[PDB]
């Protein structure tokens, strides 16, 4: 059988926030930074990228008119997003990598101060520090799709354009995470 | 097969009673290569589905050599491993644990017959171009494992009376649990045994389970 | 609007009137190609025609017919004028720099690169300084002096923070920092200190700056553990 | 859910614009030269926080009109989740409908950012007691942003445009009392469906 | 709160106006022609700082009157926050309610900006011992600024107008001793609503 | 001495048949082995030297009911108290002398300062009570 | 191969490593080489496409700049402007120092800042010539040495 391998190159245009999930590393970082970015022990940056692709395909296929389940509810197993990005039973054909940075932490990750300003007094009522990724930082991923179909590259690229417009990671409404995704498809037999 | 695997991304491998495997086992390497072999149409997938084939664990390596036996002490340097490597992850209403990446692990796949080598060399080529994904949440990007080195050295078996991995013998105080999840069969079974403790290979439950060091 | 003629596509847009080559009756702003008669029979003589090497000779005829002829990220010029005319070509002997931004590609001269090299030189020089990585008073007197200058806001949390950063860089970097901070300006008469709060005159203010200088000088001779236990009480971070 | 609101915002500066650098490494690199650097990208373009200004504009206007609107400006204040700016910009549970982008400049730091000298003059002797250098964004520099409203309503665009004219009235960025940050906004809206990519 | 004060000031210049250029690169571009460039926008219009002039005028008069006003002119002086000018123009914990715009000319450069020659003469010899060239703003040039008082009080417009008359008496910026910057002000104020944009 | 480039040569330009590249790396003498490494290198060793320099009863329950009812003694407070505790409780009640910003949660201002004081009192007393008693006390309030 | 083509001086000792901050050009037999190569290559190809000092001691340099800085012949504006013309080359610095030093034939006024003190006419002209010779001989040195010399007198060069 054949399989489809999609290399996703990613350029960062607006600063990127993905919250750190490692509790011991978080509390090691909480003495200095209140929102550490998701980081490896190889000092690289992790971004969850199967959830964003799956959510993008769910909202787009639901607003088109197709019958797709909405997570946020168990997966049905019969929709397009269950056949592509997984269901409780049937594993997903599309394994999607973490978006690993090509650079290390010291070049792309900066501690940045954010505020909360009183509306009447117009002074900084609260303060915090959060780690963020610089812009132009290049992330790489490869996603693997086993037993592909005809509507395989188009759905992935359309969800990729939904992430370009909407963003990836956290703090999405504030302008964080606006990225551009180049692609490179190949078929392995 | 002699090689060194670097955990590019961390892996999560849960066990019973609360704990996590401190490194990936050979059953996970067997499962992931079986998944790649079914996805490449190579005729080794029926042998994978067989659970008693000897025809074909991943222990951490040290600052020296390989870590030996939950702590795994180094033989020469006596560096310590374990319970500084597991990390708690609270993510979106889930609480699991993983291993920090960036650490180097052994390769142990010893084909006893030459007739499938080509086949094994072929899938190593796939690993050498794409990587193997060991553990839980494989499709989420977890459990990446690149190869740093690759070579093939023949091995004569043990000519002695320690268990680096674990073993399955009679009735034991410990409890070991593996599983069988057959694609194109819709079958998953968390099969149970007891086995002995830790510290050719088999003995005696499976080929990719027992080790005699 | 797309009409037809004897093979002719006549696509009218809001911008221009293309004609891909009987002739039409309206304006044919762009024409794409005995034909001279086909040009001459066509009303409102076209702006620029879009025309194997015989083409070029034909284009010379189209040049002689007083008709423009073309033979098949935004880029900006930050250049000079100079100019020249060699072999019927208006030229410019310039070597430069192609700068690639997200939307623009600009052509800049060597002067801009000298601007950029001066900035990068001034950036590099202020990274590595000296040997990165005394009076004496008692420890308790150091405590009450730092408490007294904390209450009157001479030694503030930011000054303690930069003092700790320059102390982690070593003894000489911190000595350079306090001699810069306590440097009385000969032409201005101010030092780089926060002025104290309170009804004071010049003599006791100068004396308080002197005890700030002596306290931060004598704290440098102590080890890092005592300095950390001395400054956490005032700057918890 | 079948439609989204796209608000393309093109903002020009009528007054010099200052917003403060937030990255510590960039800020400590910049004080070897300048005392108040302007917040920029790593691609040398100027960035302004935009969701906070629009939200603060809507909170002051909607509180002064008389609607039941919570205040998230105070220290550790909790959004209620019932007012129209809780629905539009964010709540403690429900996410914000308007994904407000940052104000990305069109030009880079060599074209629009200029380091200048600010003063502090004694009132009696009329001499410059203090002096500090601060970057600012020049006048006529243009900035682009995109406000994407998912699950739109009829009055979301009127609210966003009213907040934009309030930002014209007050200013965006920092040093607003000294005359900085006065801007002019152009709005291009459009209805899309979410399956343009499909 | 519910209302805010809008103070539109229109200031015409009576004796030539200098306010120095702040931008270091704009200075370094202009010192090949003019030794004292005037403060200018990138859109070729003249910028004048306005908040500091009104603030300094109010501190000088309210100190001479005897009212409790801090000075924010001494070296690194901080505002207490309890004064009358501390409410209008801000303090360390509170911003100023009166956001004061820059004085921007209605005309442009090369229409009100004129470059001129200044002298320094020996007293014993009467010869031009030195010469420099400075950039001024002509007399009759019209500048427009807006003051937005966020929380209006009864005495804000009177204080703003009094500071404006002090700026008429002293000059607004630049070489105020020599006679530069003598201006006059026209004030138009209205109590607008805060929710006027909420149609 | 032998000189080794740690810099990346995989970005170049061709000018006058010379394959050139503008670079801004630092030359390091290292024990008869010179090298020219990037700015990242200096970022990494500046970080390494900074880290090396860095190597050196019923009424009580009713008060917790009131305070968690208006969420000043909230779930993360109960957790971090369990994670602990005298120095913690000192560090989360001490008023900042500059801004007056106690690190508690918002719930008149006199009632706010009384409630803040009430919390400090209740938090300090529960640490007086032995473990398990407080542990059980705290479970039905924030189960974690 | 590597040919460093730069002076390996100005070597400070951050941590336990004798570093030395640098900005130059890698040219491929790879050869790291400084801004002088880019000046040579730029002049060479820019003209190929157009086809249709005194030597006084370093201690005396530092002492004389300190002396003229105390009496305000050399000032922070002059040390910054001369540094800007030194970054523009060794030919713009010659032009700038000659322009400052020159006596205008009609006035007789050199463009230096006058000394602060009670110096007479011949002493004033001798100190002006001292400033000319000192800033002329300072150019003969490389950019890093010029920077360490003037960074003491003007801390924001
Ligand atoms: Zn589904
Ligand atoms: Zn609300
Ligand atoms: Zn005050």
mmCIF file of N, CA and C and ligand atoms in Angstrom, chain D residues 70 80-81 83 86, ligand 2:
data_model
loop_
_atom_site.group_PDB
_atom_site.id
_atom_site.type_symbol
_atom_site.label_atom_id
_atom_site.label_comp_id
_atom_site.label_asym_id
_atom_site.label_seq_id
_atom_site.Cartn_x
_atom_site.Cartn_y
_atom_site.Cartn_z
ATOM 1 N N UNK D 70 -19.131 44.494 32.871
ATOM 2 C CA UNK D 70 -18.127 44.269 33.894
ATOM 3 C C UNK D 70 -16.854 45.043 33.576
ATOM 4 N N UNK D 80 -17.366 38.813 33.942
ATOM 5 C CA UNK D 80 -18.629 38.223 34.371
ATOM 6 C C UNK D 80 -19.107 37.138 33.413
ATOM 7 N N UNK D 81 -18.927 37.340 32.113
ATOM 8 C CA UNK D 81 -19.437 36.416 31.125
ATOM 9 C C UNK D 81 -20.839 36.695 30.644
ATOM 10 N N UNK D 83 -21.906 40.326 29.808
ATOM 11 C CA UNK D 83 -21.961 41.543 29.016
ATOM 12 C C UNK D 83 -21.544 41.270 27.576
ATOM 13 N N UNK D 86 -17.777 40.780 27.152
ATOM 14 C CA UNK D 86 -17.383 39.440 27.570
ATOM 15 C C UNK D 86 -17.631 38.430 26.460
HETATM 16 ZN ZN1 LIG H 2 -18.309 40.979 31.559
#
